[PDB]
Ligand SMILES: *[C@@H]1O[C@H](CO)[C@@H](O[C@@H]2O[C@H](CO)[C@@H](O)[C@H](O)[C@H]2NC(C)=O)[C@H](O[C@@H]2O[C@@H](C)[C@@H](O)[C@@H](O)[C@@H]2O)[C@H]1NC(C)=O
């Protein structure tokens with residue numbers, strides 16, 4: 162038989178009133194034995210949530226089906242031949258319903274008529290049809306093959322940021338090592354960005370399927386097809402038209418990226434396998450002696466008593482010694498983060514287990530607590546959809562934190578990971594679904610090495626439907642536990658994630674390997690997570706799995722010192738890879754972390770931007786240069802903020818690197834006399850000696866720097882150096898966000914912040930550098946000082962009343978005080 166026969170439009174109307182909407186009723190043409198029971202009647206709605214966002218919702222007309230709870234991801238509620246057209250006056254998006262047999266729909270741009278999403282079926286081809294079965298949702302759109310450039314649909318390791326043609330991307334949260342290309346990993350993000358090179362270059366939109374079910378997405382270049390194993394179609398189209406606007410629109414829906422504390426941008430050190438407190442103290446001492454900045458010390462499962470949460474190995478990590486250690490860290494302006502797994506060991510003498518059982522907090526199967534296996538052995542999983550489990554979690558964290566101070570939480574293994582696979586429930590189409598997603602690249606059963614689909618959650622909810630939300634839900638609860646036990650802005654690192662997770666947590670690429678391939682892979686992943694609203698992203702520096710090498714680690718710390726989230730972490734069965742162990746690595750580290758720390762106020766500003774507008778910290782070249790199609794395909798370079806570009810060496814033995822430069826003038830942040838000038842965008846073979854990493858700034862930008870220091874605390878009290886890069890084509894601008902570093906609600910009406918804007922422009926005989934201040938209230942309260950300005954991008958020197966570098970010293974200017982500084986040429 163045919164997979165399905167599709168739907169006809171039974172009726173359709175424009176809802177109207179003050180706010181336009183489109184309601185239709187769809188009817189199944191004919192039933193099919195393949196993939197299970199067809200939903201016979203569908204309710205179809207198209208509606209505008211904002212001017213710039215169109216929502217397509219397709220549900221069973223006669224039965225409520227699974228939807229991501231509004232509590233979990235709050236959002237505006239659903240609305241209450243021949244064609245039916247929907248369009249507002251202030252929207253660029255036009256929706257059309259085609260009463261063909263089977264039916265069709267499209268979304269195009271009012272202005273350019275450029276078709277964004279084209280779900281018109283090819284009558285002879287059911288793979289193009291809308292098919293809607295209880296455990297098989299099929300939705301397909303045609304694409305302009307060469308013109309459509311697609312990004313996202315996480316979480317997968319790929320050598321390219323831009324999605325290659327002709328693949329299947331599987332979304333199903335799984336404990337699969339990120340050193341594996343292509344395979345579905347820890348998180349699921351059913352969002353893609355579609356950048357069009359033509360007809361109007363750089364014109365971008367976003368497409369989001371708000372669905373937590375397992376799915377395959379097939380992308381063949383001229384076509385994209387969702388094949389989903391449950392829930393509903395809840396499809397959102399974001400108008401863009403810039404990439405930054407798409408992410409603004411997307412994060413407006415799924416949640417704005419969480420603020421991060423300033424210290425989170427410090428350098429982080431971890432290792433699986435640190436044997437005792439004395440060892441971690443030694444590591445900290447050795448970082449210090451190496452004059453390598455270290456902000457945060459981390460402890461992996463080693464610290465626990467027999468792999469049990471909320472406990473301390475009484476021999477190797479005794480509480481008194483641990484409290485002394487953390488106290489010393491804090492005294493030195495340093496911080497501490499421990500790991501927590503979700504699995505609660507079933508030990509009878511374990512208080513956490515006892516309290517968990519009392520509050521009935523655990524995920525069940527066939528009416529009994531589901532018995533998983535992880536590091537501690539037999540475990541029970543807290544049901545984070547259960548409010549009682551959330552309280553329990555908060556309470557356990559309170560208890561532990563009362564005894565041992567912590568500064569953040571690392572939540573791991575929260576897919577949820579399971580070292581065993583349970584037997585399927587006989588007869589259950591949930592544990593044995595009619596359509597097999599391409600789990601682990603092998604149509605592996607979904608229940609593989611996780612919690613079975615037939616397991617149950619609060620509100621009679623099946624793991625089948627909720628599985629992809631587990632880590633996300635643990636993140637919510639964990640953040641809340643931190644917020645409820647400290648007034649400081651919290652910090653959370655999560656392995657498993659879902660769309661919206663960024664509102665709560667940072668993420669890292671997981672179990673990567675000490676391989677050159679992986680070094681490179683970190684860049685697309687990093688960029689992807691920006692698109693996913695999770696800008697606080699990074700990869701284990703020098704590689705998690707496998708023993709690293711001096712050269713690899715050296716090149717890794719170089720690159721990694723610019724990850725928003727910068728952590729050295731390693732697996733236990735490997736040679737040690739702390740940065741002080743090789744001299745060449747240490748030297749690189751001091752140089753690159755040096756620059757990172759000088760850039761702290763900038764990264765913090767970028768974090769501010771991210772929370773405000775969803776714009777990622779580490780961004781693609783095409784975010785700043787969308788009109789330059791050469792940048793779409795770049796996967797080995799990236800921007801930090803608007804106009805700084807990092808161009809890493811990603812090959813062994815290489816002492817140069819072939820790097821794309823967009824139009825204009827670019828200046829090395831490591832040596833201002835080094836520059837690159839290209840009249841049109843092109844590759845340049847940059848010199849890249851063993852100790853050197855290429856980092857350049859583009860003309861038209863101002864970045865406010867501060868000084869190097871062993872801690873971020875110390876760094877905040879150093880003088881500001883303003884770096885002004887002049888452009889012949891446009892005024893230079895820049896921005897600096899400052900606050901007390903705890904306001905839970907960043908940049909809020911609470912007002913404990915300032916935004917300083919810088920401006921710079923050349924006259925024919927003079928040069929003006931100036932600043933504007935917002936929230937002078939808070940600004941006038943702060944003792945920040947600018948003592949130096951450096952001016953790049955001019956071919957003549959300037960003074961107070963081939964390229965050259967001008968430097969204005971001894972300024973003694975308060976940052977919080979708006980200034981206008983007049984300079985003249987020589
Ligand atoms: C329940 O907790 C017990 C004490 O915390 C665990 O026993 C211990 O496990 C340690 C290794 O994880 C071992 O070095 C300790 O000496 C030992 N302590 C005692 C008092 O026996 C127990 O772990 C189980 O039994 C041990 C010996 C190993 O076989 C583990 O793999 C087992 O998990 C914990 N029970 C469970 C069910 O995990």
Ligand SMILES: *[C@@H]1O[C@H](CO)[C@@H](O)[C@H](O)[C@H]1NC(C)=O
Nearest residue numbers: 829831832833834835836848
């Ligand atoms: C910096 O760059 C200049 C110009 O390319 C070069 O000649 C110089 O020796 C470099 N090193 C420095 C300033 O340490």
